[PDB]
């Protein structure tokens, strides 16, 4: 189960670089130089890395310092063959963003947030990124009167429209991906789920430029089914990027390594991505627990990739098993894929077998055989066949 760069596994600089500061504790690890992270991730078999502006260039850097930070980083990419497929903006750490960036109540903060974003879009394009992610972690509220949400959505649409005007006027070949999260660090965050983000995109001026960047743990913080939400994003043509990690139910954002948390949900996710032919990066947004030293950091990162590859093998074995293929027919998955009424509305209205002469009791007696099918999936996941 050895990863190769062809598997397209990517990691944020902020993931293996997390120093372990949590709301009740100080850092347990020293800071990692971005160049060392790139080198160490390349040896593990990763394809590339991603970054926030402030991960790569310390906040408040002079233009001269900025140029040398980028130059060092580019040299590490050239030495290793790593790519940078995605970049994003930090609009959440600095105190100025305490009430948001794009939807801060203060207008001057909103204009600053846009300029900070635009400057990193230029850098991302220079480094070859294809996707630009926006996680509005500070957009939201702890109390009801603090934020008029209709006005906030007006401001959010205004910001993303301006960003789309900028990339189209510059001729950039980059697309945007909105990352939803239901809560934390704000009491409630705007666009809290995949669904809310997909709905918002359809009101932007150039919807074709925007998709979603869903994260396993974030949808699970609302108790939702992550594979179901990914299926709706794929159905809409909007899965531009994906963040993989693990989460144990409804609680604080744990960012466990992928495969931890809800293991069966991880299996059904990999089954779906591989069956659908998703061709984007398999990106890990995770935190090595602060109990770990640097050896544990790299073990946890390796485990992300290993677990994806194990689940990929088991899902493929499941779908290729002739006994599973007949169980899928026994449960009428083949009929689900067939149109309900390709004969049209009038023919349906005239069809007495659809109502007047439909035997509801005979249809109701037909078992779905879902439990046999699900035990075949369990046996395949566990390697018990």
């Amino acid at each position: 189960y050895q990863p190769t760069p062809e598997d397209r596994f990517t990691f944020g600089l902020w993931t293996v670089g997390w120093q372990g500061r949590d709301p009740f504790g100080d850092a347990t690890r020293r800071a990692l130089d971005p160049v060392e992270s790139v080198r160490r991730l390349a040896e593990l078999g990763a394809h590339g890395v991603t970054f926030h502006d402030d991960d790569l260039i310390p906040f408040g850097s002079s233009d001269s310092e900025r140029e040398e930070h980028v130059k060092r980083f580019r040299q590490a990419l050239d030495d290793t063959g790593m790519k940078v497929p995605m970049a994003t903006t930090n609009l959440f750490t600095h105190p100025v963003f305490k009430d948001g960036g794009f939807t801060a109540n203060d207008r001057d903060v909103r204009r600053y947030a846009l300029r900070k974003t635009i400057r990193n879009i230029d850098l991302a394009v220079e480094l070859g990124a294809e996707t630009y992610v926006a996680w509005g972690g500070r957009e939201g509220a702890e109390s009801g009167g603090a934020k008029d949400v209709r006005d906030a959505l007006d401001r959010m649409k205004e910001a993303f429209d301006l960003l789309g005007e900028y990339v189209t006027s510059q001729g950039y070949d980059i697309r945007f991906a909105i990352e939803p999260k239901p809560n934390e660090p704000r009491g409630d965050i705007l666009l809290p789920t995949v669904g809310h983000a997909l709905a918002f995109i359809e009101r932007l001026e150039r919807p074709e430029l925007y998709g979603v960047n869903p994260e396993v743990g974030h949808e699970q913080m609302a108790g939702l089914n992550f594979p179901h939400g990914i299926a709706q994003a794929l159905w809409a043509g909007k899965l531009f990027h994906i963040d993989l990690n693990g989460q144990n139910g409804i609680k604080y954002d744990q960012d466990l390594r992928f495969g931890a948390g809800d293991l069966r949900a991880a299996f059904w996710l990999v089954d779906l991505l591989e069956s659908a032919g998703y061709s984007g990066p398999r990106h890990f947004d995770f935190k090595p627990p602060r109990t770990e030293d640097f050896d544990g950091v790299w073990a946890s990162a390796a485990g992300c990739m290993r677990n994806y590859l194990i689940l990929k093998e088991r899902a493929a074995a499941f779908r290729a098993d002739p006994e599973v293929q007949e169980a899928l027919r026994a449960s009428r998955l083949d009929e689900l894929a067939r149109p309900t009424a390709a004969d049209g509305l009038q023919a349906l209205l005239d069809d007495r077998s659809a109502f007047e002469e439909f035997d509801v009791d005979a249809a109701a007696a037909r078992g779905m055989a879902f439990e046999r099918l699900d035990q075949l999936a369990m046996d395949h996941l566990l390697g018990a066949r």
Copy 2:
């Protein structure tokens, strides 16, 4: 705090008529005749009632029995002045719907579900309903392989497109409202939140015909902020109807009377509906607890309306208080309503006060004054001013 029919309070026949059967217990109340419910709700000051087909016409009724059930019902409406603003279809009780209606794996069940729906659309229009609600309570799954969600969404879109073709060909003046719910009775339900439903509507052939019917308790079963979701639905122009009740957190669907559950969320909801000028029915989808006899049924229904009227008074007093109006300016709600960059993208890029000369430390030091504002809201809710 006396309701009048001008307040537009409506109730489902199935609400006060719930006999108290739950998954662990038998019914504690006898069945109510729809005619008696209409009479008793009119005396309490309700505006009208809503129904599922099977609430009004017992399943399996002959055409002759059907005509007399409707005739009796219409006479009660004429005697009381009650209206019927909304109707819906039962696609969840009968065993034939155990794997769904519109997205059942069996194609013949899906065609039956469409014919059952179309027949009740005709009845709804005859009784004057303006909105037709769809709650897909059986659309979903308990296990991952049972339902290919991309195929299921294809079938769901096919069903709603056929329904829109039917109403437009018949010249009906009725619109559809999709009611989301995250889970129960299926392990996960398709279109689980307001957001997912809004996103789905934008892929239908005639999106102008479809909106949402959100329910307080359902969004709270995913831990989401119900007033925030309503604000996004209003922003999109899609709040066609609303279901009011109460829910104590993430658990089974409690359907408590409105004002029970999360009281502060009820206050912010009423504030938003009244400020936005929502003019549709204030519909209660609630269950009088099975501890109650019929006197308790009518007390619980009266309490729904009373709590709405109390909260309406307190929210109005909050917004009209000059001290609250200056607190809103102190927290810069006025600036949130002003465009970020009406001067345009180029002017923003050329504005040195937006980045090069922006004083981030001075802006970061400005307090938001949100806690004073929220205590003014608490004082108004509690009548402590």
Copy 3:
């Protein structure tokens, strides 16, 4: 992975016998004769069955009808070799119990609940049960003023004390097990978790007679770690019985087959029960989903036992792996088992290496190596070694 009666797998009559009625739907399966269930479970390799009084003897049965129902049941046990290790009382289905049994506000209902329980204790002893379970599903409230919880706990203690007086005066060799549940069907249920039940037992007059009957899905409805709670019950010497099933997070009580839901938690549970030497029944309290016909009922029951046996093999392989044993030493699980201060309080106070000369920075730098250990557990669960 074939079960034998030596594995001690047991099932409630109400599990495979569940007809599929849920709060929104009618039954999808016909009722099962208890004699047929006993026969079919014996062929699958079960050890025995459990029952509520009303599962075996329809409510309101004459003494003559009661005798023939028991006689038929006993003959099926004799023909198959099945045992009855546990019995319990239905104090939740009949409308008279709508506000509780032992803690109903009406005193005459509380006395009736005690007499109904005592009559089934006699039957349980006659059939050889060693454990008598109490699930107070109706003990609780939907509103704050309905139930004074201090008075309710007085009544709950009074009921269990009277039951302990009864069994000791009759010379019965049977013990009680309290089954906690946080909510459903009441809005909040008294003694909602394993912890609350353990604490309550220590205030009874004869605490040695009472332990807990925890259920996987119930602790997960509060978001708690089920293996951790089982460990505390074992530590206290109070794990008298256990209910095995599956649950997908915080929502309605799903009662999925064991191994579904949180698969990793099922692995750690089996590891703990087998390591600790738990010798009681492995009881399944689960519902075959109402999508299934009778073939699916028996497939789902077989899957309960199969999943336990697979996890038992993988946990045993994990603990016997020499590489796992050195990883446990690397993470200092051996030091956790050693007393902190067997030298005593005074020696600890005089030990300068414990404070004055303790090198906190060197200790803080030691990694715990927990992520390597957890990936070894994942590899063993998945059969990737």
Copy 4:
């Protein structure tokens, strides 16, 4: 609604002193001198303050620096009349505690944790504290193999037994209170709820020395009913202290000001504390949101006390209303307080009115009248009577 020191309102130094650093953001406020906090809280009408050792004496302070920090603090207490009723130990911030204090896998860390605690017990007694709180925020795990919970509970019992030996040998008049929390910052925390903590205390060598310090928001992070848990703690005689704040459901620990979050639960809590005659401190463990400047800090602290006093008035008015007193009799709260069987077991067995001649249908038909009672409580809370 003006607080006086007779109301016994207390605040932790770490509450108003929280600088606003969260897991995704830097501090938004400068650090407060403990002496200034004492002065400002005294002017607001607080009774006293509480502290962790490291709040008052920076970690790593020399004995000489330690003496001057305490001397300054004592002078502020003398100048203002503020008391110190509670103190606690920081066993969670420093990296050395990353795997726990009392239950760390490393034995030398566990011995250090005990010595750090004992040194602050001496200081607490010197400053007059009556209660010593222990919050084991780092005791727990993110993965199943990292922590054998039976061994961890052995170590936890060993630590608390040693602490009880220390206070009894020194002749101190101080008692311990264990503060439960279900999760955060560890993935699962040991003793996660009030119930688990009460059960654990009964296995200590001197149980009379230990009680609980429950926190509103912590029990709500498991979806539990906080007034119900407080009632069980009072019933057991173990409510030694209480932490008041607000929480919006199952998510990260919000620590909102008291009265925010679940407002109805706050009403029922105040009703219970006042009815039961709880005479300990009303302690606020809350965080002014990081959106606020120092004016907002003091507004949020004032709001804690104001909301308690408003709810106290409304609960008193509820219980004194003659119409509420007859509604309580209508719902048979008076019968709940009467023994079920003071006549004894034999008389109950001989009572034919309890079973043979009990009319279950007549009893089942009696409504509980709980909804009328709950609307009277709502009207009183809202000042609508």
